[PDB]
Amino acid sequence: HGVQVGQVIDRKLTSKGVTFTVAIEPQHRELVKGDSKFVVNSRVDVKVGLDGVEFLGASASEWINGGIRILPGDKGEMKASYPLYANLEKALENSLSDLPTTT
Amino acid sequence: TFELVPGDGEPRKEFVVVPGEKALLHEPDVLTLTLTAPESYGIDAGQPLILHGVQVGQVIDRKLTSKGVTFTVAIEPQHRELVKGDSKFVVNSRVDVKVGLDG
């Protein structure tokens, strides 16, 4: 919600991909609500058009800050691993793959 | 540097020192307001309050709750009479650009 509640501790590169270990302060520990989402805010996206022009990803303060945005949830059990989504649209669609599934 | 602001009343020999951030909060006349928002909108605790292009106040602090974000702000007594309580507060921390054929 625009407020810094944590900090990325470390990053490791493996064969499968990249694993980030992050920490959340105890003050906002109760607001995590484990059934939540994490979104990348380190890249800016600009879309232009005749009627729809948008500037997503990160604002100027968000671009100079960077980091990970947290989309909170309602009720969860705080599982260990979490996925990281490339952009907002994929997070909303709950799609963790570039190509959508065939139907 | 210790700065002295004289007052009036019975003489005293003990004082409580407040930081410079809270200096406006401890003035004899000051208008303290609490305003809520679902998002921080990138507003810190040192941002000013602007009326007609003139700074008339200063944001004192920001707190994050479950419902949202609450800002406590202060208005100087000089412009206390110009507040006119049935008033509105608008975010000025983000810029918006709308393009079009004519507008």
Curated annotation (Swiss-Prot), chain B:
Residues 29-103 are annotated as: MCE/MlaD 4. Disruption phenotype: The letAB mutant is not sensitive to lauryl sulfobetaine (LSB), but the pqiAB-letAB double mutant is more sensitive to LSB than the pqiAB mutant. Double mutation also increases sensitivity of the pqiAB mutant to caprylyl sulfobetaine. Homohexamer. May interact with LetA in the inner membrane. May also interact with partners in the outer membrane. The seven MCE (Mammalian Cell Entry) domains of a single protomer of LetB resemble seven beads on a string. Six copies of this linearly configured protomer associate laterally to form a homohexameric assembly. The LetB hexamers form an elongated tube consisting of seven stacked MCE rings, each formed from the association of six identical MCE domains, with a central tunnel. Rings 1, 5, 6 and 7 are dynamic and adopt open and closed states. Belongs to the PqiB family. Induction: Induced by a defect in lipopolysaccharide molecules. It comes from Escherichia coli (strain K12). The gene is letB. The chain holds residues 363 to 465 of 877 of the full protein. This is Lipophilic envelope-spanning tunnel protein B. Forms a tunnel that spans the entire periplasmic space. Is probably involved in the transport of lipids between the inner membrane and the outer membrane through the tunnel. Forms a dynamic tunnel sufficiently long to mediate lipid transport directly between the two membranes without the need for a shuttle protein. Binds phospholipids. Lipids bind inside the tunnel. Required for outer membrane homeostasis. Contributes to membrane integrity. It is found in: Cell inner membrane.
